[PDB]
Amino acid sequence: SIVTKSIVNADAEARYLSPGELDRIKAFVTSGESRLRIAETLTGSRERIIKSAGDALFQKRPDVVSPGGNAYGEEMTATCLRDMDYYLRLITYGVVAGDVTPIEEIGLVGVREMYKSLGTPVDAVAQAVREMKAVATGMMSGDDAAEAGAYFDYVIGAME
């Protein structure tokens, strides 16, 4: 969360927490209801988001669903949607955390190495999280869409 990051910052600088970041933790504390609402709406409509985003990705980039591509077949397309499920789950975790660090710890360290192993094109995954971002911000109200799009934007930035 923001509190662990402020604590490791005050630890490496070997001082107490500044009143600026105490005010940051307090503002995060008061904005908990808005982030709960955002993560609530995202956990509500995860299937519709995944279905529309996967069909938009397959319409945009047909290489992955082509023969010889990565996600070819029923189980491979289902595993592709499972990976999109994991990434939307980490998006909700980072949305409720107030920080991008659980998304970093769980699903951003070695995604290039492991997708280099599986043969998955990583830019296709960046396009998938782009479509998930466009659909989820199409669902939300514009201010909350900006908040969720910050974390989605961070994920596609760490992808490509």
Partner 1 sequence: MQDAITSVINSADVQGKYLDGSAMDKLKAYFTTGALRVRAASTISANAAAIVKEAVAKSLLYSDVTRPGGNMYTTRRYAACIRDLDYYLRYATYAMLAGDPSILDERVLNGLKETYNSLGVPVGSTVQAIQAMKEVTAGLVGADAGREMGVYFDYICSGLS
Partner 2 sequence: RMFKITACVPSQSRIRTQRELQNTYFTKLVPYDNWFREQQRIMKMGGKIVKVQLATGKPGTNTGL
Ligand X SMILES: *[C@H](C)[C@H]1/C(=C/c2[nH]c(/C=C3N=C(/C=C4\NC(=O)C(CC)=C4C)C(C)=C\3CCC(=O)O)c(CCC(=O)O)c2C)NC(=O)[C@@H]1C
48/116 with CB nearer its own copies: 116
DSSP string, 51-119: HHHHHHHHHH-TTTTSTTSSS-SHHHHHHHHHHHHHHHHHHHHHHHHSSSHHHHHHHSSSHHHHHHHHT
Give the span between the Cα atoms of 90 and 120, in whole angstroms.
19
- Could you say which of 44, 110, 138, 157 contacts partner 2 (CB under 8 A)? 110
**Under the criterion CB under 8 A, does residue 12 sit at the interface with partner 2?**
yes
Specify whether the backbone of 26 is left (phi greater than 0), alpha (psi in -120 to 50) or beta: alpha
Cβ(157)–Cβ(120) under 8 Å?
Answer: no
Return the range that interacts with partner 2 (CB under 8 A); candidates 29-37, 44-52, 58-66, 100-108. 100-108
- Could you say which of 10, 76, 106, 122 contacts its own copies (CB under 8 A)? 122
Residue 128 interface partner, choices ligand X, its own copies, partner 1, none, CB cut-off 5-8 Å depending on type: ligand X
**Under the criterion CB under 8 A, does residue 19 sit at the interface with partner 1?**
yes
Return the range that interacts with partner 1 (CB under 8 A); candidates 12-20, 47-55, 64-72, 134-142. 12-20
Residue 48 beta carbon to ligand X: minimum distance, rounded to whole angstroms: 16
The structure tokens listed for 129 are 């999280």
Cβ(128)–Cβ(58) under 8 Å?
Answer: no
- Residues engaged in binding its own copies (CB under 8 A): 2, 5-6, 9, 16, 18-20, 22-24, 27-28, 60-64, 66-70, 98-100, 112, 116, 119, 121-123, 146-147, 150-151, 153-154, 157, 160
As annotated, the binding site includes: 80
